[PDB]
Structures are given as C-alpha cells and as structure tokens.
Symmetry: D2
Subunit: 471 residues, 4 copies
C-alpha cells in the first residue's frame, strides 16, 4: 500500500450523498476546507461527513482549514458577469460602486495608491490579463491584453506590485475562530511573506485557547526569499503553485517547489505540493501525460503529500482523480521510495535516533519501524528519510493521528498513555497483533522515550520480536 | 542562450503566412512533418517554408518525417461524425461498410480474429473507452464505458491485444519515398516493437539510394521490453507518451521516459520527449503548473529535445507554446545544465576523448568546446555529458548540421573539407572570429581526427587560444 | 589516553624484581608466555607476577599462552655452539647423534625423505642460510651460503618444503594442559595451516573441561591461502611476521599483514601484529625511523594490538620499548583513530546495533559508548569501527575483561549479573560515577540485551544522562 | 619493471672496483654525494664512476650533491675517541682547545650564549644523550644520561634550542661551487627552515652561471611549520628522518612524512624518503620486518623515491640493500601502483592536460603515456598521479633525463629539438620502435606543446598507433 499522502479539497462536487465517504475509501488522507468559498453550514456539514467517514473506515483523515488570506478580488457587476475582450478599456476603482463592463470595484483599497502604468493584472490565476494605462484619482484604467470572462468577486494578481495588507484579514480571524471551535486538526495561511505571520495566527489561537499546526502556503516572492525562516517558524509548508505561478514567473516554480520540499525535509516539516497536478481531470476521466509526470516528479522530489484542488472541489471525476493520483504515486514507490539525500548529518537527539532506527530496521529486514510520539516530531524525523519499511506512529493524543495524516509513509495507532517503556512495547505487541499482517515472532524496531509522555524525551531503540520475552 | 532543443509539429496552424518563419525565429530546432495528416502539397509547402526560414535566419532546422506506422483507425461514418454515449452498443467490423452510429469499419482486418470479450478500446488517445462484449462472425460488439464524439478515421488502441501488422505499411513506404526525395534530414517510425524494424526502413532507403537517421518512437510494451537493443539498432529514440500512455498504464510512463532517456545518453543517441508537454496551450496562452513541471523535469531527466504536437500543429498559440517551452528550459539551465551521471566509464575512443575534452574545457574555464565530426558521433558523446560550455560541431556535411539540430547544447558550423588538423584549427579561428562573441586570445578546446574526413578517426585534443601561434 | 593495545613477551629480562609490575604500569595490556623457552616454574612465577600487577593496579592484563607448534629445530652440538662459515659443507641428519660442527640432528624426522637438492634452509629467522646439496640415506648434506653462529636447538625454516607434522605436538598438549590449569585467558597456536587446526585445540580443552579464546598465528603460506576460513574458525589472529617473513618472501609480508588485519576486523576478531616492530631497542634506547614507521602504520592499518617479542623478553630496554611503542600509538591516534572502512554493511543483529550505537554516540558528542557483553562479541563489533569515543565493556564474567584486553580502544568493568535492562543502566551510573572523569548529567550511549546474561541477545540502545530519570 | 625510484649514497663501501657500476645495474636511479664526508678527489672519482655506469648501461642516473648545511659538530679529542659513560660530567666549550674526555670544543660558537640548563644534547642521531647542568663563561657543563662512544667531529643535536646559523656555511658555498663545476644534476640543502633559504642557493648558482634543481631536506620544526611555502619555493623535498627524528619527537615523524609526501605531489614536486629504511642491512643480509614494512608504506604513501644512506655508503651489503629495496617496491606495485588521491582538482594548463592524458591512456588500455617536456614540469604532473601505464618523458635536454631519474614511474628519452608537433610524434615512433617491447600498431597517448621548445606551452593530446598515418 501507498506511502505518499493525498490531500483533497471539499466543495460542491463532494457534497453529493456519501461522496466524502467515497473519497476517504479511495485514499483521501487530508480534507482541505477552502474558506474562500462556501457558508459555515457547508463547512460544518463537510467536516461532519469527514469525521464519520474517518471513524467509520478507521482511516485517519486530517481536516485542514485553508484561510483565504489578503486575497485581492474584483467587486460585483450589475450583470453578475461580463466579457472582457482583447482591446477593451476597463476601470478598476477603490471607490464604492456596483460594477459594469467598463467600471468595477476591488477589495484592495490601496490600488489607486500602489498601481502605476505598465503594471500587469492577471485574473482567475492568469486567463484574462490587463495592463495598467492610467490611475485617475480613485480609478485604475487598464487595457485587456488577453481577453475572456470575469464574474462577481473574481480574484486578481498584481505581480511585483508591493501589497500592504494584514497577514490575517478580519474575515480570516472569524474563519480561524469558527474552524478551531469546529475541531479542525491543522490551519493553512494563504500569502505568507514573513516568518512573523505565524505569531498573529498563534495570538488568535491563544485567545480561543486552542493551537493546531499552522501550514505556511508558499505563493509570494517574499515567502521564497525567506523560505528557511518561514519553514522553521511554521509547522508545515504548502507549495501553492496556482498563485506562486502568477506572483513569480511560472517557469521559476518547478525549482522553487524542489528547493522548498528539500527545505521542509531538512527541518522535519510536512510539505504539500498543490494545484493543477491533474487539472484536466476536472473535465476528463484520464489526465495528460504532463499531469501524470507532474505527480510522479512531486513523489521523487520528496513531497510528504500531493493535493487536489478543483479536481475534487468542483470536478466531474473527484473519485477518479483521487484513484488516479493514488495509482501514479504507487507506480513510483513500487520502483523505489528513495528521496534526495539530506545535505546535513542530523544533530538533534530525535534526528540522530530516528536515523539510527531506520538503519537498524532496513539492515535487519524488520517488518516495521515503530516510533512513540507526543508531538509527532520523532516520527517526522523518520518519515523525511523515506524508508520502504512500514512506519507506525504510536501516540496517546488522537489529534496527533489526524496531524500525521499528512506526514509521508506514516500510519498512526492510538494507545493509552503508558508510564513505562516496557508498557509501550506491550502496547505495540497488543495493537499490532490485532492486524492479520503482523504475527508473533515478526521482528520490529521500536523508538521510545522516558520519562514517558514528555516531548523530546525520545532516547531508546529496541529490536523486538512480537510476543517474545526480549524486553 | 538555451541548450535543450525544441521540436515543433507542422499542420493547419503553421500554414498561415510566414508562421513557420515565426517558429524558427522563436527557437524551433526541428520541424516534425506528421504523415498521419495532410496532402503531399501541404508537406512540400511546409518543407519549403522551413528550408527558407533556416537559410534566411541561419538557424539550423532539422526536418523530421514522422511515419504513421501500423496505426489502427475507425472507418467512415455516413454522417462524418456520431456521438457515442456511455451505455450504448457499438459494432466495429473488419467487413467493408459505410459506417453509422452502431456499425463502423476499422483498418485492422485481423480485429474479429484477435479481439476477445473483455478487451478494452481507447479512442483519440483515451477520451472515449469501450469494452468488447462479443465477436459475431465479422463484427465486434462493444459497450461504450466512457462516452464522447467519434469521427471518420479516428485512431483507436487495443491495449495488450497482440496486433499482427508489418512495421512499415504500404502507405508508410510511399511517405518514406516522398520524404527522402523531398530532402528530409531524419525519419521517425511509429509503433516500433523490435530492433529489426530498422532493417525494413533501411531496405527502402537503399532502393531509393538515400539513408537518413531513423528515430524509433517508443509507444509499445514490446519497445520498452527491447529498449536497449532498439536504442542500439536505431539512431535516435522518441518517448511517444500519447500512445505509450494508452498501450501501457499511464502511471508507468514517467519512469519509462526516465529509463529511456538514460539508455539513449549511455549509447550517445538523441532522445526526444513528446506529446502533451504543454497540452493546455492549444486553448490557453499560459500552461498548467503540471505542464511547466513536466517540461522542467524532461530537462533534468537529460532529454536532448522536447516536442510540441497539437500545441503548434492545430493550436491557437503555436508561437507562445514555443516561447513558453523555451523560457522553462532556460530557467532550469540557468540554475544548472547538470544531467544524471552515466552508469559506465566510456570505453570507445570517441567517448573517452570527448569525456576528456569536457574535463579540460571546464577545468580551464574555456570559452567553447569544439568537435570536428563527419557523422556527428564524436559530438554526440560530448553532448550527452551536458557541459555548461558552448558545444560547437564543425563538419563539411551540411545534412549533419540539420541532424545535430536535435542533439543537446549543440550549434553546428559548415566548413570546407580539410586535409590537415592544422587546417581544421585555422577553420575554427576563421569561423569563430566572424561572430562578435569570440575574439583573438579567447581559450578554446578542439577535438579532431586524422586521417581527416574519416568517421571514428577522432584521436586528438588541442587547447588553442584564438588567433595565437600554438599549433 | 591510548586506544591501541600492547602485547609484551615475558622472559629473562622481565624476571627482575617488580619488572612485570613496571610493564603493566607502563601500559602492557597482554602478557605473552612463550612456551618455546623456560620451564613451568619460570611460567608460574611470571603468571603470578602478572595477576598481582593486574589486581594491584586495576589494569586489565590478559595472559596469552603461545604454543611452540610443530617448530623444526637443530639437535645438540658436542660444543653447545659452533660457527658455520660461508663455503663449508654441513650434514643435518634425521638419525640420533651428538652434534659435531659438520654433522647435527634435527627434530623433523621426515627431513631425509622430504628435502631435495636446491632446497633452502634459514636458521634463527634468516641470518644463517644453507642450500641442500645431497640426501645420503638418513643425512642431508648442505652448503653454508650465508655464514654465522648456530647453537643447541636453534630453529630452522625450509621455505616451500611441504612439512608433515601434527598441528599440536605432544609437548604442545602438555603446555596447553599446564596453561589451562594455571588460568591463562587465551591460547596462541604457532604454524596454523588449516581452519580444522582449532578442532584439535578444542578437543584438548574439552578433555580438561576448560575452553579459552584460540589465536591463530599466521606464519605459513597455507594460513594466508586459507585466511578467511581460519579467521572464522579461530577467535583471533596474530600476524607472526618473523616466521611469515622466511616461509613467504619477506617482501610479501607488508600486504599480507594489511589484508589479514582487514579480514580480522570484517569478522569482528582481534588481530595482533607481531615481531621486530622495535627490534633495535633490544640493544638501543631509541628505535630506527623504520621501526617508528612500522608501529604507526600497524595502527593506521587497523590492528587491535601490537606485540613486542625480544624487546621485552631478553632486551636491555623492556620498559623503554613499551613506553616508546605507547608514545607512537598515541601520536597517531591524537591525529585520528580512523581505520580503513569495512567493505560490507553489517548483517548480524549485533553488528548493525553496535554500528548504530557508534553513530548516535559520535553525532550526539556522547562522553562514552557502553556495551554489555557476555562473550565480548557485541563489544568487538563496536571496537573494529574505531570511534574516538571511550568504549566501556560491561560484563559479569571476569575472564571477559582479560579477553578484551587485546580488543582495540576497550576498557572493561566487572558488575554483578543483572536480571533487568534498568539494572544494567543503574550499574553503569554506579560504576562510572566512582571515576573522577564521569559526573552526573554526562551523556552516554548504552548497548544492552534481553533476556539478560544470554549471548547474542543484544537488542537495545539507550541514550542516558548519568544519574537522571530517563529509563 | 619498477616505478618507484631508488636513491643510493656513495662512500667507502661504493669505492671498491666498479661497485658504482654494480649499484646502477641493480637499480640505483640517483647517486647521493654526501659532502659531510670525503675530499674532492673521492667525490670526483665517484661522480666519474656514475657517469660511466649511466652511459655504459644507458640507465639514467641523477647525481645529487648533498650539502652538510649548518650541522653542529663536536671538536677534536686528544685521543681521537673517548667513552662517555652514563653518570659522567662533560664540558662542551665554544673556546678553542684540543678536547679530552671531560672537555671538548664544538663548531657552534653560540652554544654558551644559547644553551640553558635542562637543555638536551643527542649525539650521533640519538645514541649518546646528555642534559645541560651549567653554562660557566665559555663552557657548557653536561651530565651523560645515556652512555656510549664519541669521536672527533661527531654530530650533535640541541632539540628545541633556537640555532642562529647561515642557511649556507662558507664550506657549503665551496662544496656547491665544486659540485656545479663537476656537473651534478641536483643539489640538496640540509636543515632548511625558511622558503627564502633557496634564494641564497640560487644567488651562488647565478654568480657561477649554472642552476640545478634544489632539494629542501626536511629535518627541522621550522621546515614542517613552513612545509607548503618551502615545497613551492624549492624544486623537490627530502623527508630527512635521521635529524627530523631528533629535532622533533621521533613518534611525530611518521605523519610528517605522510603529510610532506602529499604536499609534494599536490604541487607536482619530487619527494624522497630518507634514512634507516633498511638500517639493519648495514650488518645483515636481510632486513627487519619493520624495515620491509617501512619501505612498502613509503610506496603506498606516494613517495617518488626511497633513499639508502649507510646501507650503501659504509654498509656490508650495499648491493643486497638496493636489490632488497627493489623487490619490496616491486611487490607493492604488482598489487597496485595506486596513491592517495589529490585533495584538489588540477587548475594549471599542464595539470589539467596530464590528468586528462592519464584518463585517456588507462580507459583505452594504451601501451604507454608519452609526454614532451623542456623543464620536466608536464611529466611531473602525470607522475604524481601514479598510473600503472609506462610513463615516457621525451626531451631534447640531457640534464632533464638525469633530473627525472627521481620522478615516480618515469623513463626518459633524449631526442633532437623538434620544430613541429608532427615531428615530435615521428620522434616517438622512431625511439620506441628501437625497443623490442613496442611494435607498429601499438596505441600510445602523446602529450605535446607549441610553440615547441617553450616551457608551459604543453597544449595537445594525441592518441597515436605506432607507425600508422593518423597525425
Ligand atoms: N502512549 C504514550 N504514553 C506515554 N508516552 C508516550 C506515548 N506515546 C508517545 N509518548 C512519548 O512521546 C515522546 C516523544 O515525543 P516527541 O518528541 O514529541 O516525539 C516519547 O518520550 C514517548 O514517551
Ligand atoms: N570539415 C572537415 N574536414 C575534414 N574532416 C572533418 C571535417 N569535419 C569533421 N571531420 C572529421 O570527422 C571525423 C570524426 O567523425 P565522427 O567519428 O563521425 O565524429 C574526424 O576525423 C574529423 O577530422
Ligand atoms: N552484568 C550482566 N548481567 C546480565 N547480562 C549481562 C551482563 N553483562 C552482559 N550481559 C549480557 O551480555 C549480552 C551480550 O552478549 P554478547 O552477544 O556475548 O555480547 C547482553 O544480552 C547482556 O544481557
Ligand atoms: N624535443 C623537443 N623539441 C622541441 N620541444 C620540446 C621537445 N621536448 C619537449 N619540448 C617542449 O617542451 C614543452 C613542455 O615544457 P614543460 O612545460 O617544461 O614540460 C612542450 O612545448 C614540449 O613540446
Ligand atoms: O526546529 C528545529 C529544526 O527542525 C532542527 O534544528 C533541524 O531540523 C535539524 O534537525 P536534525 O538535526 O534532526 O536533522
Ligand atoms: O553503438 C554503440 C554504442 O553507442 C556504444 O557501445 C556505447 O555508446 C558505449 O560507448 P562510450 O564508451 O562512448 O559510452
Ligand atoms: O563469526 C561470524 C562472523 O564474525 C560474522 O558472521 C560476520 O562477521 C558478519 O558479521 P557483521 O555483519 O556484523 O559484520
Ligand atoms: O608551483 C606551482 C604549483 O606547483 C601549482 O600552483 C600547484 O601545483 C597547482 O597545480 P595543479 O593545479 O596542476 O595541481
Ligand atoms: O507519436 C506521438 O507523438 C505519441 O504517440 O504521443
Ligand atoms: O640528512 C639525512 O638524510 C637525515 O637527517 O636523515
Ligand atoms: Mg492560493
Ligand atoms: Mg504515436
Ligand atoms: Mg613464529
Ligand atoms: Mg641530515
């Protein structure tokens, strides 16, 4: 079975009866709730459907709350939608108005103040392109250079224009509050551009008295310029290639992806690769050769998880998309699970020990690597190494099973909080012997710590045969 | 400037006035003439337009004749086109008939004899899918399992069904004859499945008294099963991912590509990667993030050349497609031109010397590597290594400049046939000093042979400063 | 302090009052009792003096019983000693007789029937050389080719002559019996030439109901031809360079040494390098530059132990010899303790775990590696790796401390037989805290097993801070 | 045949009738004339005997003039010799006197001024050792701590005492003058301690209008402290282990040797390893196991040349010593000629090209590497690499054949000064075809330059079959 994790986005196409169930059964490891779209009713109903499916199948499924961030958007049109034809003049104003074809508002109130002639405007992640002709008082006069359809509240991008906007919008803070109370397992922040952006997320979490892992979505030059600092301050990163591929030259993204995955793994942080991996499966039952390649290469790059956006959220083949993504990952890993080596020898106790654990497992042809983890840290230093051996995280904290759903190669087991290392090993034997696949005598390598239930306490490797008296 | 070579396919969208010129000016290195489509008038007019553009710009442009091979195709419909809806019964007969919705002919006259119930039928490279229910005398009854439109003479694929059909069809032999007389520089054969398939191509070439380099298109299991033998018998290979991705599981293609590129380079043969690299640019001015990734990864894989099929042949943005492909390749090579190392130390005189030549060039920060070549062999053993140094092929045979248009990193220079090594070096000085970019004193490494104008005679490396008395 | 172990040979020069004490205080790790020389009184008195010095200093000192083996020797001369002058004819007979200058006996009674004209005879490890002229019935007439003095019972070598003689002589069996009852810790067998030679040693040990580790002395072509098999059947090996350098071309010995050390370490067996390492210190207070080099190079070769023969046994500077050898080893190890890498990844549980233990220790800058061992095996798989970290063997079997005296880099600690892993760790804390060098908080890596007091049970690594509650 | 070069020292034992001839015939590559001993008659007669033997055998033999340097020596004794017994008081004065047992002069006039109580005095390279008790006006009162015999003008060492003495003594300048006029090929300077010491040697050479290569003898801490600068300013280095092993701790010498050989080879300079390699062969026909080891290890260290001092100069077996040294080197090289890799990629034109030349040779199983050289530089960058292929230097300067006698693996060929590269290749064919060993067709790799007869002009590699038309 598969090692690389699959993130799916919920929306209209995953609202049909028991479709969230179908996704989980097909291999969805993480469910992305995109707070750009939908009502709190829609989110609640979706989150419910995931918990049921997770608990009914016994498949771990993390729930990821994606916060819109300071996204810039067009206003409302009198018509709901217009057609912007190559050669037409369009005014985009910071003034209040009901838009029409040639004059519409935007959410960014600093547009008049920050946009200068020659500035480019990409709509809907690149399809309709304008150039700024003039800024007259409150209006921004543009010429459509690539033509197409625009609708109410369609998103835009002003590449290289310096955008002043709080890391968390007032709407994001309410979405974050709603999501923390609802019981989501992780939070993703759009348009991160500083390591300090996590402090503001944390501030809100502390008010509400609930912290979850915070994913930095990489889709801004400032993010890549500060990749290292951000990967260290945040708990995971997403290569958000849609916005990244308009905010940077689209031809720069491939190497930024590769460099960001390598940075994540060096620091034992989850990395998701996102957006258009199987874009064509929105309309078609099979993907393009490019798409198949893109997914295979994300695996060999060393990505913890690949994500589907529109493929599952609004697509015609959300199921086929997940199944297809699964087959491709499996095809690659059958050949080899190998990842690009780390460019540093581990220095932290948990890194050194997890590295050693992998070594002993592989060299002794063990049936499993088992790590005990309170925060998931010890497990994440073993995942990044990419062994072909099963990696089994043992934890007393159910949320950590949901958190590790986006960590490479990792199945998690909830067990009572133990007061001894011998107890942890009895737990392993107990848990593992329930599965047909493990038998008494089978050799496994166990990583553990003392004093138990203490983070960073991990200090022990035990080569154990299941059920034998070797403790 | 760019090292990786770009192959474009000519068709309706590259027939508009001076568009073939625009392609060459935008960076087209090889022009594919696809003999699946078009009249001999259409091909002649296109081939003319390429020679003019090549000669008018002084950009080398190879002309590649792609032979349809034993492609299986549907017959004619009374309507020209029908709609095959998920759930419908369709008869495909080896009998002669004008088709309608529920009964149509195919070109494969062995279909009744070779198709068994449960066999799958993919149309138009996968979009419409049938399953074989029954073979009733001459008719093959199928159920549409994925629905869509079919037209006259649309191509089909019977994956894993053993197809008996000659390597060269009677139509291919006439297309090959036409193409050799027209003056094409290389020939590509569809659906190669044995190393001996090249003997039949050669046979025809010998009758006509004209041999060109023969590209094996890899798009059949038998091809990959015999990859090594084929790469040795043929002069180049194309990873033809369209048909390969229906004839094999589409999830297997990514690693077959990688393994086929590595096999090409080990044996100093050109490899093209083909089909759907920028598929979405048929309709759109920018590609998908998957597409951008697919192209970048073909470069890092070590592909001599990337190809555009429908992107240039029938697409709306043939120019943007070439420009976009060029930017992506350039983005990757700016970072590094490095390729996956070879798994063998060179053993052949030309391999050893070209390897050594690269070493001396790079270590001495030379301005250029220069190799003299009659067949292009000596040059191709340097190309596969992927140095960031300019690689300048010197030849007396104009066709060889067109042949090396699909070899990595290589610009070619036509010079008189020399009778001495000192003559070859004077030639270099003269040719190079015409370009602004080279000046007297500039350090350059020259590979040459004696007796001159003899293939495999290469036996000499000379570290030369341009215009200085060091011979 | 020093990692490489020093073996000293006892004889006349180490019989002086307190000399054996002085040797131990100067760094003697193993005391060789050479059963070629001395009577049982001399051996007893020497063995007593070693146990006292070991127990009085608390320095581990192994006692090695070196068995003469089937050594070929000259008979008795009427004069005790004669002079064999270059050019003289000498008869060496298998017949019984009192030795005249020109006619003497030998112990080898197969000489007449095994010696053919042209055969060479080296005396006293090479200094006087003869050639065989004629074999007359029972006499072997030779011509002195290199001249010098010979005495009663002087040893000879017939290089390349096939010698039929039991692996254990009648006198060896009595020396072995005497040595096992006396309480020696290891046994060395001279002139091993088959892996089965250890079976005959074991046979005697089983009769007497006492087994000790058996060292194969390598000093015969048959030994080197069977190096691997011998290293696997025996518990250690000695490169016995004196006899090896007359039985083989002396110019072959340097690489045989290197290849025999590498073979020992691959299979986790002790290797001693022996004979003439500091030969000139028999007469002189400082060695030759060659001698200094020879010792340094034995260290970099990866030798567990270097031996002194005549330097301590009959020499004028037994003390200086040990001190000097110690300074040289220390000089080398100060720079680096690094050894030639192993040509195989460990496959045995104990190899894999000890390798991993080293890794964790070095990477975490631990103060010590600690291994619990019943047979010393687990410790010996860590020793061969040559870490700069102190290596501390913990055992309940006092003999094992004496056995590990000849294992690289290893100090041993006797502790009560423990019934738990937590017990072993409390033991470590207690033993180590007695030494000034270790304090509470100091980081150490502990290797252990369960069920305890079982050989090959080793299955556990524990990163422990001394005195802290982390078990 | 052998690659590593053998330096022999001439003296009383090489004055017997055509003994110098016997040495050359046995493999002496360089003859050391030690100007510490002998008068100019003795040197002339010896130098004559070497030129005759070299010319009569056609074996290249370099002649090395070793200059005594600022060696500190005892004065004359009334008796010619006394015995200094452990426990005796000895006065060593800077005042003029005919010595006796209690009171003797020295050459060092700064002894009273520079020697303080507690200072150690080694005599005759270590055998008799004193400690300084008091300095009374002009006298240095010492206690014999190690006893033995001393004679007229015996050499002493004051380790760690700062010695003020010119790099060239007045006696050295006259020996250097005599040696340059006599026609010696190289000059060795004792007790180098600064890179500028070569400037003073050069100064004298320039006055006399003759420069030869200057060997820095390494035997002082200041030398090792400045190893790199010295190796760059001087043309070769000798590890002079006799004095180095009293001026430094003798236990430090082994690693200084290794580090000095590595430094020589990195900068393409010859390194000789000197003194006591086979010390025991002064008295004995076979060496010690240490001695055999010392020679083998000098080879694997990467030494261009091993030297014999007393073994040939005063020894009883000068011939056996050379033969024995030869067998050991040959034994090692049979197994492998491999040297410790260089820690830098070559950067100079001649380094890069010679590296490349080796590559092409080895990979194509060439019969020889051939390099054309004016100064020997191009050859010396190939030698340091240690290929198992024959290395044949071609030069028009006969002295360069004598100079390359101490460069690893190198046979030299004198040829007319050529005006073309094609000429150099004709020369090779001609010279090589005279030897039975080379035949027409045999492939060889040739390194050359233009304009010819210019140092550092080397810029060409040619893969040539002997006698074939491939130029
Ligand atoms: N079920 C458990 N009971 C007690 N401690 C646990 C349990 N599961 C994991 N741990 C602890 O998780 C710690 C490692 O935490 P971390 O450094 O966050 O991986 C180890 O010290 C384990 O003792
Ligand atoms: N312009 C030329 N005139 C004469 N020989 C050439 C010329 N160009 C290339 N060659 C020869 O091509 C040979 C190498 O051919 P190949 O083995 O096909 O690379 C070398 O011997 C070159 O000298
Ligand atoms: N003091 C001890 N008490 C109980 N077992 C010990 C003790 N010392 C060493 N051992 C055992 O030595 C075994 C290692 O055996 P070996 O494979 O011979 O190294 C470990 O499994 C330890 O349990
Ligand atoms: N016999 C020769 N006649 C002319 N030039 C030579 C001859 N031998 C060597 N050389 C040149 O000496 C230069 C090499 O000098 P070096 O850099 O000192 O080795 C090259 O240009 C060689 O071609
Ligand atoms: O947050 C801290 C970082 O993750 C570590 O400092 C870094 O990851 C080093 O980890 P290791 O030494 O375990 O690779
Ligand atoms: O056609 C022959 C193949 O190309 C060679 O056998 C292969 O290329 C190996 O040659 P090299 O030693 O130049 O890599
Ligand atoms: O006596 C047996 C040998 O020592 C082992 O079988 C061999 O040494 C393999 O051990 P490792 O895999 O631990 O090096
Ligand atoms: O005297 C100069 C030195 O030999 C060079 O600078 C040094 O040897 C580097 O040369 P290569 O780069 O050829 O090793
Ligand atoms: O021929 C092709 O290009 C294919 O099959 O993709
Ligand atoms: O000069 C020498 O040869 C020495 O000191 O060993
Ligand atoms: Mg986004
Ligand atoms: Mg095809
Ligand atoms: Mg012996
Ligand atoms: Mg000296």
């Amino acid at each position: 079975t598969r090692r690389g994790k699959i993130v799916c986005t919920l929306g209209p196409a995953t609202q049909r009866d028991d479709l969230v169930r179908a996704l989980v059964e097909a291999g969805m490891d993480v469910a992305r709730m995109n707070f750009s779209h939908g009502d709190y009713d829609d989110h609640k109903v979706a989150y419910e459907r995931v918990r049921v499916a997770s608990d009914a199948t016994g498949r771990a499924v993390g729930v990821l709350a994606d916060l819109q961030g300071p996204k810039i958007r067009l206003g409302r049109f009198a018509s709901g939608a217009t057609h912007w034809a190559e050669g037409e003049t369009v005014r985009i104003t910071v003034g209040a108005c009901e838009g029409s074809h040639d004059r519409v508002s935007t959410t960014y109130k600093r547009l008049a103040q920050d946009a200068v002639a020659g500035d480019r405007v990409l709509v809907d992640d690149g399809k309709v392109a304008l150039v700024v002709d003039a800024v007259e008082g409150d209006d921004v006069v543009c010429t459509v250079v690539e033509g197409g359809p625009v609708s109410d509240n369609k998103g835009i991008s002003l590449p290289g224009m310096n955008v002043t906007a709080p890391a968390l919008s007032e709407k994001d803070i309410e979405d974050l509050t709603f999501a923390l109370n609802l019981g989501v397992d992780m939070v993703a922040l759009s348009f991160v551009r500083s390591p300090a952006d996590v402090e503001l997320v944390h501030e809100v979490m502390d008010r509400i008295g609930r912290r979850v892992p915070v994913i930095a979505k990489l889709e801004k030059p400032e993010a890549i310029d500060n990749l290292e600092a951000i990967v260290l301050a945040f708990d995971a990163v997403m290569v958000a290639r849609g916005d990244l591929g308009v905010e940077l030259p689209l031809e720069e993204v491939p190497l930024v992806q590769k460099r960001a995955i390598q940075m994540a793994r060096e620091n034992a942080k989850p990395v998701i690769v996102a957006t258009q991996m199987l874009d064509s499966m929105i309309e078609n039952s099979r993907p393009t050769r490019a798409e198949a390649s893109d997914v295979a290469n994300a695996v060999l790059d060393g990505a913890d998880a690949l994500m589907l956006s529109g493929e599952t959220s609004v697509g015609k083949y959300p199921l086929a998309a997940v199944r297809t993504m699964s087959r491709i990952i499996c095809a690659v890993e059958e050949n080899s699970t190998a990842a690009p080596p780390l460019t540093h020898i581990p220095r932290t106790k948990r890194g050194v020990i997890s590295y050693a654990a992998r070594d002993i497992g592989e060299r002794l042809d063990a049936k499993a690597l088992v790590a005990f983890t309170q925060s998931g840290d010890t497990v994440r230093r073993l995942a990044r190494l990419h062994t072909p051996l099963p990696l089994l995280a043992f934890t007393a904290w159910p949320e950590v099973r949901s958190q590790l759903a986006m960590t490479w190669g990792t199945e998690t087991f909830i067990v009572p909080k133990m007061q001894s290392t011998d107890g942890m090993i009895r737990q392993v034997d107990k848990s593992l012997l329930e599965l047909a696949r493990y038998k008494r005598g089978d050799l496994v390598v166990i990583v553990a710590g003392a004093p138990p239930g203490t983070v960073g306490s991990t200090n022990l490797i035990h080569v154990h045969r299941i059920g034998e008296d070797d403790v």
